[PDB]
């Protein structure tokens, strides 16, 4: 029985960067992946210039699926749920509702686009630290579960054009009245940077999202089958190093996944309001960690408070 009490007429502000509820989630997740699904290769370069260390263990593979994790607090420690519409991450909340435990959060450790998570408010929501600084990572979440069918991934085109259209209009509302925003191909980097890691039946297919971001939107269609990759050896996302796993049980791997989120990089030129250009990438472990628990804070109390009076009662 999840408990929740709405707070009326409480103009409570919320910052998705100073939560402190966020602080414990990645610690629980890293400790869990360690006790958990194990690679056959562990690498930790450390100066003990540095000495590359290595830990070898077994790597069994099982069908994996994220389960919802609510976040409960000890005695006291009241948690507050922001439930407004216009939430830009570092913004106030008219509709606040305290909770004893968090909502049905379904997190997924992933790359650029958040998989199987929560939803934004009515189109998408630009919740990043800075909206149009060429120095911060864009933090947006989806509003519709974008179904991606991977066998290579048969990415739909109408839903992709619609999500690009909703995000492009929100970017224009945030910045640029009469502006054209065009999408560019990948930024460059590692496997998980150019391509996208996601839970596909336990495995991680890797499709470069460069054939998806080439849409020119104007202010004034069966399946985009991208080329994915069978995952056996990748850089570890927990820390700095590499991994190695067991071969898949399927040659053509079937999976059903709904992706909900939009975290990507940007060129950063100026190119300010003439045209806006954005590239895929991003999906930090530290930032996805902040992205799940973005509307809360923890406060506690003892039953007290005053009124200075002249009541004078004995004792």
């Amino acid at each position, epitope marked *: 029985n999840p408990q929740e009490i709405h707070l009326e007429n409480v103009t409570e502000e919320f910052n998705m960067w100073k939560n402190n509820m966020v602080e414990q989630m990645h610690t629980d997740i890293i400790s869990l992946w360690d006790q958990s699904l194990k690679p056959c290769v562990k690498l930790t370069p450390l100066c003990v210039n540095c000495n590359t260390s290595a830990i*070898t263990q*077994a790597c069994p593979k099982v069908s994996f699926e994220p389960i919802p994790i609510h976040y409960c607090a000890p005695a006291g420690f009241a948690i507050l749920k922001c439930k407004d519409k216009k939430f830009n991450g570092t913004g106030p909340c008219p509709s606040v509702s305290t909770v004893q435990c968090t909502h049905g959060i379904k997190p997924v450790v992933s790359t650029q686009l958040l998989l199987n998570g929560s939803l934004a408010e009515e189109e998408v929501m630009i919740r990043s630290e800075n909206i149009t600084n060429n120095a911060k990572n864009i933090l947006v979440q989806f509003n519709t579960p974008v179904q991606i069918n991977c066998t290579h991934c048969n990415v739909s085109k109408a839903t992709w054009n619609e999500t690009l259209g909703k995000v492009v209009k929100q970017l224009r509302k945030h910045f640029g009245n009469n502006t054209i925003i065009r999408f560019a191909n990948s930024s460059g980097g590692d*496997l998980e940077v150019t391509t996208h890691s996601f839970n596909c039946g336990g495995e991680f297919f*890797y499709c470069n999202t460069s054939g998806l971001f080439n849409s020119t939107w104007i202010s004034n269609n069966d399946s985009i089958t991208l080329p994915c*990759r069978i995952k*056996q*050896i990748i850089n570890m996302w927990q820390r700095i190093g590499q991994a190695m796993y067991a*071969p898949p049980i399927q040659g053509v791997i079937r999976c059903v996944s709904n992706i909900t989120g939009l975290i990507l990089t940007r060129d950063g030129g100026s190119t300010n309001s003439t045209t806006e250009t954005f590239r895929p990438g991003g999906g930090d472990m530290r930032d996805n960690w902040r992205s799940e628990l973005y509307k809360y804070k923890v406060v506690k109390i003892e039953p007290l408070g005053v009124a200075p009076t002249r009541c004078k009662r004995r004792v």
Partner: antibody
Amino acid sequence: EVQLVESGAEVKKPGSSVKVSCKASGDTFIRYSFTWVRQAPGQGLEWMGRIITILDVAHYAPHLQGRVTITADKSTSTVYLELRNLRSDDTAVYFCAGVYEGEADEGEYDNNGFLKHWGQGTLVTVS
Amino acid sequence: DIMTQSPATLSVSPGERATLSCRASESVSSDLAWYQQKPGQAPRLLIYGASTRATGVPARFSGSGSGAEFTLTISSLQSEDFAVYYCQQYNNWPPRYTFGQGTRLEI
């Protein structure tokens, strides 16, 4: 697909250190796991160890733990094999072997145990 | 914890259907390589996967079996079939795969 040329047959004493090279020219040298296969004269083979080049992790036989150090050089494309605490039956024809393992650096890699390509053989006699 | 072959000595004339086995210490059933190592030479891979031949290997090497015991069968012992054959598992973890015992097909 790689071609492998080893070092020459050398004569040693029981309880000394020797070093046996393995030059590999061909496809990507680091993506292929090399495997040293000794050849005892007359009988079945004794599995010594298997070394993935980019991982530079030389596996070793449980009985050979501490008497063999298989090193590898990615630059000169030469995999070395060090044998200390030698014995009489250590006289054998060693076979470093190359095999298409896929992409140990980028993606799909099944860590195959089979060996398609081979070396040239090196009868490291010990006397 | 592991490969051997059942025929130890086989002095058959070339042409006779030889015997080439593969004895293990544990069940595999899906991962076995075969080799053709003439005495003093390198092993030539014949069968990989235990159910399909290799590139350049003729159909005379009909290797089969499912489990721990395997058997490479030769239809007609050709004049190039004389060697010391081997078999290597590629199933368990960590890789500690030994080779077979061997059987000579001397004239």
